[PDB]
Amino acid sequence: VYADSFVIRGNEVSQIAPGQTGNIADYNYKLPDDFTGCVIAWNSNKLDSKVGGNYNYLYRLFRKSNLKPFERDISTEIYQAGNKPCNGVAGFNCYFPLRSYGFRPTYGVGHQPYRVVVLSFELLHAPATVCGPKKSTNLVKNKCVNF
């Protein structure tokens, strides 16, 4: 079982779903179309926003192409948004990809930060490792049972 958690704005919770596309399911975190397991999301405005605004949370904005499901990209560079090549730093038609959220308690529902964690299982014919509270019993052979 794999549990990976991240903080997103409450507006984009619906984009964490199989088949959804947008500004967060195409450049940041994409899910497969045959996804098993499922998500959990709860509001966390109590401890994620300041009166002056929380600027510690980032999200990618520009990428060359959409990323395959279950992929990560922490690289930093300067986007080529024009004919003139961008050597580095900031310039016209040369954008920095990462941008900062601006969570504040004044904002209404839909702009306050949300705290989401997604679980992922798998059901394949492999030696099982984790499951719930069941008590094993004795084995019966050559008799009609309910195994």
Q: Which long-range contacts (CB under 8 A, 24 or more apart) does 2-5 make?
A: 2/119, 2/120, 3/117, 3/118, 3/119, 3/120, 4/117, 4/118, 4/120, 5/115, 5/116, 5/117, 5/118
Asked if 53 touches other proteins (CB under 8 A), the answer is no
Identified binder of ligand NAG from the candidate list 39, 41, 61, 67, rule CB under 6 A: 67
What is the phi-psi region of residue 111: left when phi exceeds 0, alpha when psi lies from -120 to 50, beta otherwise?
Answer: alpha
Asked if 65 touches ligand NAG (CB under 6 A), the answer is yes
Structure tokens at 7: 């903080």
Asked if 146 touches other proteins (CB under 8 A), the answer is no
**Shortest Cβ 134–ligand NAG spacing (Å):** 39
What is the phi-psi region of residue 110: left when phi exceeds 0, alpha when psi lies from -120 to 50, beta otherwise?
Answer: left
Asked if 72 touches ligand NAG (CB under 6 A), the answer is no
Structure tokens at 101: 């959220």
Asked if 105 touches other proteins (CB under 8 A), the answer is no
Give the contacts of 130 (CB within 8 A, at least 6 positions apart): 1
Contact partner at residue 93 from other proteins, ligand NAG, none, CB < 5 to 8 Å by partner kind: none
Stretch that binds other proteins, among 46-54, 68-76, 84-92, 96-104 (CB under 8 A): 68-76
Asked if 7 touches ligand NAG (CB under 6 A), the answer is no
Binding site for other proteins (CB under 8 A): 2, 10-11, 14, 17-23, 32-33, 67-72, 74-77, 107-111
Binding site for ligand NAG (CB under 6 A): 64-65, 67
